[PDB]
Structures are given as C-alpha cells and as structure tokens.
Amino acid sequence: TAKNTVVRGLENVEALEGGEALFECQLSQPEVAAHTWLLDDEPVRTSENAEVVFFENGLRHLLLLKNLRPQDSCRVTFLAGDMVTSAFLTVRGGLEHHHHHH
C-alpha cells in the first residue's frame, strides 16, 4: 500500500500444439497485499503442465505452461490491485477429437 502502477500488461500469445506459453507482466509494486490470477475457470497452479513462478520479489510475474492442447484456448486474466491486465490465448491443434483424458 505505497505504490502500484502497471507498466506493461499481458499480450497475445501464439504457440503451436505441444508447445509452451510465457506471459511476462512488469509492474511497479515491490509489495504483495492482494493478488488473484484466474485464466480459465481453474486456479492457475496445478503442476508442471501449468504453474506460476516469479522473481524480483513479484516485480516480474512469469507463467509457464506446456503440452498446449487446442482446448487450452481460453482467457488469461490477472488482477493485481487497481491494475488489470488481460490477453487472449491462441494455440493451434490437429485432431478434431480426442478420447484421452477429456
């Protein structure tokens, strides 16, 4: 509660099937009071196939995904204090259907 001002918000991301995704957001706020990150309607943590990591004490929020299936095409929303950044998710596919863990 001293200074919070986003310099760069999220941006469009393009990755082919079976690729990874990287969302780098740079904001001025070396403090953590309340931060919520919800992309698809699922908490963004889980495991290797998805998980948040960041350095510089949260000054550089980086989210890495993997094995991106066409399905992933969802919404990326990050709400950090009076600053909100949001960007689209786009990933190509191949098979029209799949019977492996729907």
Tab-separated table of C-alpha atoms in Angstrom:
chain	number	residue	atom	x	y	z
A	1	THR	CA	0.000	0.000	0.000
A	2	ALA	CA	2.651	2.503	-1.111
A	3	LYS	CA	2.879	2.421	-4.904
A	4	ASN	CA	1.193	0.228	-7.527
A	5	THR	CA	1.245	1.002	-11.238
A	6	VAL	CA	1.380	-1.478	-14.105
A	7	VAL	CA	3.881	-0.554	-16.796
A	8	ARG	CA	3.191	-3.461	-19.124
A	9	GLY	CA	0.096	-5.638	-19.215
A	10	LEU	CA	-0.362	-9.046	-20.811
A	11	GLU	CA	-0.205	-9.586	-24.588
A	12	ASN	CA	-1.401	-12.041	-27.232
A	13	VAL	CA	0.444	-15.382	-27.258
A	14	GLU	CA	0.849	-17.704	-30.261
A	15	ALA	CA	2.141	-21.260	-29.894
A	16	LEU	CA	1.593	-24.412	-31.964
A	17	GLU	CA	0.216	-27.628	-30.478
A	18	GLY	CA	2.509	-29.346	-27.988
A	19	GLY	CA	4.255	-26.039	-27.226
A	20	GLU	CA	4.660	-23.826	-24.148
A	21	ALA	CA	3.351	-20.352	-23.250
A	22	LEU	CA	5.030	-17.459	-21.446
A	23	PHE	CA	3.214	-14.404	-20.066
A	24	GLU	CA	5.556	-11.711	-18.690
A	25	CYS	CA	3.997	-8.752	-16.856
A	26	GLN	CA	6.111	-5.938	-15.419
A	27	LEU	CA	4.558	-3.779	-12.668
A	28	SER	CA	5.867	-1.261	-10.133
A	29	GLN	CA	4.958	-2.705	-6.740
A	30	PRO	CA	7.632	-4.372	-4.532
A	31	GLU	CA	4.849	-5.419	-2.151
A	32	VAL	CA	2.112	-8.058	-2.000
A	33	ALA	CA	-1.246	-7.144	-0.441
A	34	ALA	CA	-3.748	-8.991	-2.613
A	35	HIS	CA	-3.208	-10.675	-5.995
A	36	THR	CA	-5.543	-13.078	-7.831
A	37	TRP	CA	-4.712	-14.908	-11.077
A	38	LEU	CA	-7.507	-16.792	-12.857
A	39	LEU	CA	-7.181	-17.730	-16.518
A	40	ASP	CA	-9.542	-20.487	-17.429
A	41	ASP	CA	-12.054	-21.114	-14.661
A	42	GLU	CA	-9.325	-23.171	-12.905
A	43	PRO	CA	-6.845	-21.926	-10.245
A	44	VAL	CA	-3.561	-21.327	-12.044
A	45	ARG	CA	-1.169	-23.527	-10.133
A	46	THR	CA	-1.603	-27.249	-10.663
A	47	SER	CA	1.772	-28.857	-11.621
A	48	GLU	CA	4.374	-28.813	-14.438
A	49	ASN	CA	1.710	-28.684	-17.172
A	50	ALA	CA	0.898	-25.293	-15.627
A	51	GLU	CA	2.215	-23.290	-12.642
A	52	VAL	CA	3.121	-19.698	-11.696
A	53	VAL	CA	6.667	-18.580	-10.941
A	54	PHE	CA	8.132	-15.106	-10.421
A	55	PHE	CA	11.282	-13.267	-9.320
A	56	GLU	CA	12.484	-9.803	-8.284
A	57	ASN	CA	10.008	-10.086	-5.402
A	58	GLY	CA	6.976	-10.230	-7.724
A	59	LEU	CA	8.124	-7.382	-9.980
A	60	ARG	CA	8.230	-9.823	-12.917
A	61	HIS	CA	5.311	-12.275	-12.989
A	62	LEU	CA	6.068	-15.174	-15.380
A	63	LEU	CA	3.614	-18.066	-16.036
A	64	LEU	CA	4.844	-21.176	-17.925
A	65	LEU	CA	2.528	-23.798	-19.475
A	66	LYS	CA	3.324	-26.914	-21.569
A	67	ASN	CA	1.893	-29.597	-23.887
A	68	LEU	CA	-0.611	-26.977	-25.005
A	69	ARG	CA	-3.707	-28.720	-26.370
A	70	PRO	CA	-6.148	-26.862	-28.667
A	71	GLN	CA	-8.521	-26.961	-25.721
A	72	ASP	CA	-6.301	-24.603	-23.730
A	73	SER	CA	-7.595	-21.730	-25.924
A	74	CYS	CA	-9.039	-19.755	-23.014
A	75	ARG	CA	-8.937	-16.393	-21.224
A	76	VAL	CA	-5.878	-15.066	-19.367
A	77	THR	CA	-6.877	-12.635	-16.589
A	78	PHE	CA	-4.536	-11.121	-13.973
A	79	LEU	CA	-5.961	-8.777	-11.294
A	80	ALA	CA	-3.201	-7.105	-9.259
A	81	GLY	CA	-4.566	-4.157	-7.271
A	82	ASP	CA	-6.064	-1.149	-9.101
A	83	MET	CA	-4.297	-2.532	-12.210
A	84	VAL	CA	-5.807	-5.159	-14.510
A	85	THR	CA	-4.059	-6.834	-17.459
A	86	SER	CA	-5.765	-9.313	-19.829
A	87	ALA	CA	-4.700	-11.053	-23.064
A	88	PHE	CA	-6.031	-13.761	-25.379
A	89	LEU	CA	-4.730	-17.356	-25.580
A	90	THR	CA	-4.287	-18.889	-29.053
A	91	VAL	CA	-2.930	-22.358	-29.840
A	92	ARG	CA	-3.310	-24.474	-32.968
A	93	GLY	CA	-4.425	-28.115	-32.913
A	94	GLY	CA	-4.533	-31.144	-35.213
A	95	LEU	CA	-7.034	-33.809	-34.185
A	96	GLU	CA	-10.711	-32.827	-34.309
A	97	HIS	CA	-11.394	-35.030	-31.276
A	98	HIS	CA	-9.589	-36.920	-28.509
A	99	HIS	CA	-10.521	-39.774	-26.140
A	100	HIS	CA	-7.506	-39.331	-23.854
A	101	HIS	CA	-8.459	-37.623	-20.589
A	102	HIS	CA	-11.224	-35.297	-21.769
